Design a protein around this ligand. Structure first.
Ligand code: CDL
Ligand code: ZN
Lengths: 92, 456
C-alpha cells in the first residue's frame, strides 16, 4: 500500500503517464469562438465601457423579467390542480 | 478687415515641389537602378541595397547572414586581402556595410571620376568572394569578441529581447549575431547555401546620389552585374503577448524597460499616422533638455512625468515605430530608478492610451512640426539621400517625392489619429522586456489592462 503511507507513497504509473499526454496546437471549440467573433458583439457593444454599462443594464432589465415569467409558468405547470385558481369554489 | 487676419499663408512651401527628379530603370536581368542629381554637391555616394537579412536564415544556421558580412572582405578570385585593402585605401574613399533583419547594405563615397572603380569593387566583393574554410575558422574569434561587446550595450539587448519575446514563432525572432554554439559550428557550406538561396537579381537595387548621371551608372551596372543569377505562400508573423524579465540586484540602481505593440506594414495606408503617433508621445532626457523646462513643456506626457512626486520619475524615455515588409512594432523604451519604475512606466502607458480618447489639435500640430523638422532635417547629404532612395525602392517599389509626403501628412487631424489608435492600440496585446532592479516592476496584466480606460 503506497497510498497515505510516508514509508512508500508515490504516484501510480498511470498517473505519471496522464501527465505526459499533450494537446499542443489543437483546439476543438474553435467553431464556437469563430461564430461569436462573427457576430461583432465586441466591436459594437463591449469595446467601450459606456456601451458595456448600457448593455449590462438593458440585458439585466429584459433577462430578469423573462426568467421570472418562465419560472412562473413552471410553478403553474408542476402544481396543476393544487393552486387556488385551478379549482374554483362553488357556492352551496 | 484687421491686419491680424491678413497674414501670409503657405502650408507647403514652393520648394517642396521644385525638387530634382528621381530617375529609375530596370535592366533585363531584373536589377533596378535609381538616381537623383543634386547640383549643390561635389562628391557622390553609390551603393547596393539587398532585400535579405537574418530573417532569411534557417534555424539550423541562424547567424550565417552576419558571418557573410565579414567574409566578403576577406578576399576574392581577382584580388588578395592585402590587395583589396590597399585598393580601398589608395582611392581616399569610404566604404561601409551592414546587415539587419530584412535588409543588407553596402555603399561608398567618392568623387565622380572614381564611380566606375567603386562599382567594380562592389560587384567583385558581392559576386566573387572566396569563402575559405581556413579563414572561416579564424573569423570566429572576432565574431565571438563582437558578441561579447554587444552584451554591454543595454538598449540593443533590450530591443533584441523584445523581438525574441514578441515573435516566438517566426524568423523575426532571430538575433542578427546568432547563438554562441552556432558561431562555433559555422561552416563554409552554410554560408554558400545562404548566398545561393538569397542573392538573386530581383532582390538587389543600385542607388546613387550627388554628382551622378543616370546613363553612365546604368551602363556600368549592365557591364559588371551581368553574372548575378536570376530567380527560379508565406503568412503573417504571429505576435505573442508575453514578458521576459531578467532580475538582477548587483548592477546598481537603474532599471531598463521596453514595451511593444503590434504595428503595420510599410505599405499600409495608416503608416503615416503611425509615424505621427510616435511623435505625439515623443521623448525626454533628464540630463540634457534644450531650453524648455520639462515642467512647462507643451508635450503633456513629458510634463506629467517631470512633475511626479515633485521630483520626477524618469531618467530617459523615448518612443519608437518600426515597420517591416509584412508587420511592425510600436512602443517605447525607458530608464529609471528602482523605486520610480512603476510610475515611470504607467505614466507613459497613460500617454499612449490618451491617443484614443482625448488628444487635441494643438498637440497634433506640435507633433507635425517636430516630425517635419526631424525628417526633412536629415535629408541633407549625399549619403542620407542615397540611403533614402534605396530604402524606399525596396520598401515601396518606388521613391515617394517630398511633396507627396507633405500633402499626405497635412490632412491628418485629431479625429483621424483618434480613429487609427482606436483601430490598433485600444485593448490590444503588449510585449515586455526588462533588466535590472525589477522589484518595482508592474505585472503583465497591469500593463495589458492599462490599454483601456474605465472612465468613458
Ligand atoms: C452595504 C454597502 C456596501 C457598499 C459597497 C460599495 C463597493 C463599491 C466599490 C467601488 C469600486 C472601487 C473603487 C476604487 C477605484 C480606485 C481609484 C481609481 O483610480 O479608479 C480609477 C477608475 C477609472 O478607470 P481609469 O483610471 O480610466 O483606468 C482603469 C484601468 O485602465 C483599468 O481598471 P483597473 O484594472 O485599474 O481596475 C479599476 C478598479 C479599481 O478597483 C480595484 O482595483 C479593486 C476592486 C474594487 C472593489 C470591488 C468590490 C466592490 C463591490 C461592488 C458591489 C457593491 C454593491 C453595494 C450595494 C449595497 C447593498 C446594500 O475599479 C473598478 O473597476 C471598479 C468598478 C466597480 C465600481 C462601479 C460601480 C457603480 C455601478 C453603479 C450602477 C448604478 C446603480 C444604481 C442603483 C443603486 C445601487 C446601490 O475609477 C473607476 O472607474 C472606479 C469606480 C468609480 C465610481 C463610479 C461611481 C460610483 C457610484 C455608483 C452609483 C451609486 C448608487 C447609489 C444609489 C442608491 C439608490 C437607492
Ligand atoms: Zn561584426
Amino acid at each position: 500500500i503506497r497510498f497515505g503511507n510516508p514509508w512508500r507513497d508515490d504516484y501510480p504509473e498511470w498517473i505519471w503517464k496522464s501527465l505526459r499526454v499533450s494537446r499542443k496546437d489543437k483546439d476543438m471549440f474553435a467553431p464556437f469562438f469563430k461564430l461569436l467573433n462573427a457576430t461583432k458583439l465586441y466591436e459594437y457593444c463591449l469595446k467601450d465601457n459606456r456601451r458595456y454599462c448600457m448593455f449590462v443594464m438593458g440585458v439585466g432589465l429584459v433577462s430578469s423579467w423573462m426568467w421570472s415569467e418562465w419560472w412562473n409558468s413552471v410553478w403553474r405547470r408542476i402544481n396543476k390542480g393544487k393552486l387556488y385558481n385551478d379549482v374554483p369554489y362553488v357556492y352551496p | 478687415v484687421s491686419p491680424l487676419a491678413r497674414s501670409v499663408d503657405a502650408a507647403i512651401p514652393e520648394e517642396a515641389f521644385n525638387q530634382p527628379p528621381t530617375l529609375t530603370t530596370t535592366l533585363p536581368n531584373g536589377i533596378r537602378v535609381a538616381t537623383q542629381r543634386l547640383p549643390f554637391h561635389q562628391t557622390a555616394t553609390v551603393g547596393v541595397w539587398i532585400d535579405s537579412g537574418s530573417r532569411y536564415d534557417t534555424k539550423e544556421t541562424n547567424g550565417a547572414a552576419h558571418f557573410l558580412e565579414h567574409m566578403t572582405f576577406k578576399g576574392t578570385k581577382r584580388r588578395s586581402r592585402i590587395q583589396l585593402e590597399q585598393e580601398i585605401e589608395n582611392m581616399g574613399a569610404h566604404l561601409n556595410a551592414y546587415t539587419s533583419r530584412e535588409q543588407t547594405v553596402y555603399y561608398a563615397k567618392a568623387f565622380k571620376k572614381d564611380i566606375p572603380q567603386c562599382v567594380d569593387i562592389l560587384s567583385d566583393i558581392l559576386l566573387n568572394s572566396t569563402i575559405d574554410e581556413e579563414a572561416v575558422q579564424m573569423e570566429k574569434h572576432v565574431i565571438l569578441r563582437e558578441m561579447e561587446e554587444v552584451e554591454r550595450q543595454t538598449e540593443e539587448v533590450i530591443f533584441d529581447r523584445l523581438h525574441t519575446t514578441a515573435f516566438r514563432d517566426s524568423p523575426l525572432g532571430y538575433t542578427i549575431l546568432g547563438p554562441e554554439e552556432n558561431i562555433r559550428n559555422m561552416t563554409r557550406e552554410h554560408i554558400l547555401e545562404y548566398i545561393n538561396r538569397n542573392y538573386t537579381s530581383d532582390r538587389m537595387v543600385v542607388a546613387a546620389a550627388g554628382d551622378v548621371d543616370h546613363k553612365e551608372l546604368t551602363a556600368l551596372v549592365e557591364k559588371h552585374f551581368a553574372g548575378l543569377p536570376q530567380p527560379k505562400p508565406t503568412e503573417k508573423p504571429f505576435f505573442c503577448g508575453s514578458e521576459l524579465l531578467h532580475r538582477n540586484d548587483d548592477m546598481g540602481p537603474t532599471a531598463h524597460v521596453a514595451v511593444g505593440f503590434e504595428g503595420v506594414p510599410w505599405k499600409s495606408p495608416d503608416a503615416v499616422t503611425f509615424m505621427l503617433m510616435q511623435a505625439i508621445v515623443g521623448s525626454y532626457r533628464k540630463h540634457d533638455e534644450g531650453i524648455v523646462p520639462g515642467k512647462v513643456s507643451a508635450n503633456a506626457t513629458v510634463r506629467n512625468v517631470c512633475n511626479k512626486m515633485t521630483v520626477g520619475c524618469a531618467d530617459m524615455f523615448s518612443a519608437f515605430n518600426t515597420c517591416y515588409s509584412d508587420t511592425g512594432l510600436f512602443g517605447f523604451y525607458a530608464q529609471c530608478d528602482e523605486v520610480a519604475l512603476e510610475h515611470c512606466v504607467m505614466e507613459i502607458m497613460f500617454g499612449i492610451t490618451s491617443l484614443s480618447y482625448a488628444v487635441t489639435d494643438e498637440e497634433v500640430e506640435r507633433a507635425k512640426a517636430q516630425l517635419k523638422t526631424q525628417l526633412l532635417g536629415h535629408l541633407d547629404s549625399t549619403t542620407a539621400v542615397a540611403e533614402d532612395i534605396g530604402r524606399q525602392m525596396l520598401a515601396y517599389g518606388r521613391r515617394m517625392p517630398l511633396a507627396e509626403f507633405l500633402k499626405r501628412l497635412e490632412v491628418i487631424d485629431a479625429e483621424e489619429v483618434k480613429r487609427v489608435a482606436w483601430k490598433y492600440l485600444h485593448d490590444a496585446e503588449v510585449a515586455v522586456a526588462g533588466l535590472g532592479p525589477l522589484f518595482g516592476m508592474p505585472q503583465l496584466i497591469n500593463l495589458r489592462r492599462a490599454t483601456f480606460w474605465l472612465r468613458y
